[PDB]
Amino acid sequence: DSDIAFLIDGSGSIIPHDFRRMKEFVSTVMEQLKKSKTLFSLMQYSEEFRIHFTFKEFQNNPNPRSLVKPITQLLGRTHTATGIRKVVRELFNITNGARKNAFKILVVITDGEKFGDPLGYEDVIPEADREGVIRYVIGVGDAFRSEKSRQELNTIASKPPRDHVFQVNNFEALKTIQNQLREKIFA
Ligand SMILES: [Mn+2]
């Protein structure tokens, strides 16, 4: 029914406590959204990319908190474009447990503008729309409190941005967006 992936920014700018707050938020959202026909998957990215759980592994152990708890920060830069390409191509791959015909959803959480990435969003976004992946993005912190940086949030997110883009001042404020995300996803 619904294949919901998460692409979480694990860059060096996110101090340890904010990283745990992001893990608390993902656990909470996954728990609130869990239904028999919903599988979840997660990838963390910096300048490195790590699949923490595939849809298959989540199906065999549908416990968000036990799957998320052990996750450790990758540190490094922010290769957001490459992160979404690997999500589209690997996370939503049938061999990883994705269900053909399922609604494909991706929730991106980042605290900074893409930097150092060899790929541009122009190399990644069109393929994502072609594969049907609906995208939500949550921009956290200072990196996104200007009009210019918000455009990047819009570029990542599905149309219209007003329905798929969330900005929150700090990782502590993520909890302020929990209900809206869930209800946007459910709708
Ligand atoms: Mn960062």
Side-chain angles (χ1 to χ4, degrees):
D1 182 86
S2 294
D3 278 5
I4 317 180
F6 279 82
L7 175 64
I8 63 162
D9 187 345
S11 65
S13 56
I14 301 161
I15 59 150
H17 198 357
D18 278 335
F19 192 72
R20 293 190 304 273
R21 282 161 163 132
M22 180 177 63
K23 293 198 306 177
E24 296 190 292
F25 177 87
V26 306
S27 298
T28 305
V29 173
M30 285 189 303
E31 293 182 323
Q32 286 177 15
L33 294 168
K34 201 276 175 183
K35 292 176 307 208
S36 43
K37 266 284 164 53
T38 297
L39 293 189
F40 293 94
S41 193
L42 189 142
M43 178 175 279
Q44 185 195 344
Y45 78 91
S46 58
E47 49 190 78
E48 295 159 86
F49 312 89
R50 240 92 284 269
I51 298 180
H52 290 125
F53 53 98
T54 58
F55 291 113
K56 185 166 50 183
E57 298 179 336
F58 176 86
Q59 191 179 275
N60 288 352
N61 182 10
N63 182 7
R65 302 196 171 274
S66 94
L67 291 177
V68 183
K69 192 83 185 177
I71 299 178
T72 53
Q73 199 163 2
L74 294 175
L75 300 181
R77 281 165 190 116
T78 317
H79 289 19
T80 318
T82 295
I84 145 164
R85 167 174 284 184
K86 285 185 174 283
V87 157
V88 171
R89 296 186 185 188
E90 297 172 15
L91 292 195
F92 290 111
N93 187 7
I94 300 304
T95 67
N96 280 137
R99 283 90 46 98
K100 169 192 68 182
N101 197 197
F103 292 108
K104 298 311 186 171
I105 299 168
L106 177 71
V107 179
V108 177
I109 312 169
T110 182
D111 84 318
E113 301 166 74
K114 182 175 76 89
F115 179 75
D117 198 333
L119 260 15
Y121 287 122
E122 59 272 10
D123 291 316
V124 142
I125 296 304
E127 181 180 340
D129 276 332
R130 291 190 288 266
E131 314 280 16
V133 186
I134 292 299
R135 294 162 241 112
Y136 294 88
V137 67
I138 300 143
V140 187
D142 300 313
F144 299 112
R145 41 73 141 112
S146 56
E147 203 248 83
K148 202 278 183 178
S149 57
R150 237 305 217 308
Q151 290 298 355
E152 179 161 348
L153 292 187
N154 298 351
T155 302
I156 291 161
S158 290
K159 290 167 194 163
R162 44 183 178 268
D163 289 341
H164 305 264
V165 171
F166 297 87
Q167 213 291 135
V168 89
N169 284 343
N170 44 67
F171 282 90
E172 200 191 330
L174 284 169
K175 300 62 170 71
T176 286
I177 243 65
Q178 238 133 248
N179 298 1
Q180 291 153 65
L181 221 206
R182 186 228 299 134
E183 294 309 323
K184 276 289 173 47
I185 286 175
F186 277 157

